[PDB]
Amino acid sequence: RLKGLTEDEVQTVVMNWSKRQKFKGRPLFDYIHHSPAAKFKRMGVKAGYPDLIIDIARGAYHGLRIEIKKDGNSYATPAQKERIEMLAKEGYCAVVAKGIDNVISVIQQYIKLGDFDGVSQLTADK
Amino acid sequence: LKGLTEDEVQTVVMNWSKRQKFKGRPLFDYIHHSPEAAKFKRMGVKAGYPDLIIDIARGAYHGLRIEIKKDGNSYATPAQKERIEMLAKEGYCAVVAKGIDNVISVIQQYIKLGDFDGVSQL
Ligand SMILES: [Mg+2]
Ligand SMILES: [Mg+2]
Structure's resolution in angstroms: 2.0
Q: Minimal Cα–Cα distance from A15 to chain B, Å?
A: 6
Which residues have C-beta under 5 Å from ligand 2, the single-atom ion? B 51, 68
Q: Where are the beta strands (DSSP E) in chain B?
A: 21-22, 25-26, 31-33, 52-54, 64-69, 93-98
CA A7 to centroid of ligand 1, rounded, Å: 7
Architecture of domain A1-126: 3-Layer(aba) Sandwich (3.40)
CB nearest to A32's CB, from B44, B92, B116: B44
| Contact residues on chain B for A29, CB-CB shorter than 8 A | 44
B57 to A62: CB separation less than 8 angstroms, yes or no: yes
Q: Which of B31, B104, B15, B53 is nearest to A53 (CA)?
A: B53
Question: A57 and B56 in contact by Cβ < 8 A?
Answer: no
Is A67 annotated in a binding site? The answer is yes
CA distance A72 to B120: 43
The answer to whether residues B31 and B53 touch, using CB atoms and an 8 Å cutoff, is yes
> Residue B27 corresponds to which amino acid?
L
> Which residues of B are documented as binding site for Mg(2+)?
6, 51, 67-68
List residues bridging with B95 in a β-sheet. Answer: B66
Write down the experimental method used for this entry. X-ray
Domain boundaries B1-122, corresponding CATH code: 3.40.1350.10
CB-based burial label for B12 (10 Å; 0-12, 13-18, 19+): middle
B95: CA distance to ligand 2 center in Å?
11
B14 closest CB neighbour out of A16, A30, A43: A43
Q: How far apart are CA A52 and CA A11, in angstroms?
A: 9
State the greatest distance between any 2 C-alpha atoms of chain B, in Å, as a whole number: 46
Q: How far apart are CA A57 and CA A123, in angstroms?
A: 16
